[PDB]
Design a protein around this ligand. Structure first.
Ligand SMILES: *C(=N)N1CC[C@@H](C(=O)Nc2nc3c(s2)CN(C(=O)CN[NH2+]N)CC3)C1
Length: 187
């Protein structure tokens, strides 16, 4: 049947880093659940775009497992993910079940907070590098997208299409990723 993604949407999330992965995954035929960290109520993003979640995280985490857990960035959004006991338990489980975790821009700092994928090669946004590398628990990469086994990281809004297509390729293969890429008019 279809592959399944969980996108965790926290107050202060980067809206582009949220919507690009959600839309590109849905174009690939992935069943995506946009799950509000704080419940099912609309979420105010970093630039004040308000997105209505499909479900609360409390509900969506009962409808697992998921083929991928997706962590957008945003300074406050990543801080909120990093502080959530609920997110820690979901990432821990995903890691334990050899499930893909994907985090973009500041999003990877929530991996550090929840002690997820220690020893992985990761990228982040340049401004999040010092936070991510505090305590030297990862190897740093300048790749626009970095995939080290089941830890997939990316750098910013401008790598969001590459990040999303890398998730599609990982879940559905090269051919589906090429079909979704074709009408996007990427450079
Ligand atoms: C991509 N989503 N992002 C969000 C804005 C930019 C970014 O990473 N900005 C940051 N500002 C700070 C960061 S990352 C790290 N930081 C701390 O986490 C220190 N205390 N821990 N939360 C200071 C501000 C790219």
């Amino acid at each position: 049947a279809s592959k399944r993604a969980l996108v965790i949407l926290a107050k202060g999330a980067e809206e582009m880093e949220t919507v690009i992965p959600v839309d590109v995954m849905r174009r690939a035929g992935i069943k995506v659940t946009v799950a509000g960290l704080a419940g099912k109520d609309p979420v105010q993003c970093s630039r004040d775009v308000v997105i209505c979640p499909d479900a609360s995280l409390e509900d969506a985490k009962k409808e697992g497992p998921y083929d991928v857990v997706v962590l957008p960035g945003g300074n406050l959004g990543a801080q909120n993910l990093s502080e959530s006991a609920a997110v820690k338990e979901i990432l821990k489980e995903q890691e334990n079940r050899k499930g893909l975790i994907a985090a973009i821009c500041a999003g990877p700092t929530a991996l550090l907070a929840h002690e997820i994928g220690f020893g992985s090669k990761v990228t982040t946004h340049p401004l999040a590098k010092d936070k991510m590398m505090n305590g030297g628990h990862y190897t740093y990469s300048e790749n626009r997208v970095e995939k080290d086994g089941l830890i997939l990281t990316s750098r910013g809004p401008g790598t969001s299409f590459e990040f999303a297509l890398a998730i599609v390729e990982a879940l559905n293969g090269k051919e589906v990723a090429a079909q979704v890429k074709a009408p996007l008019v990427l450079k």
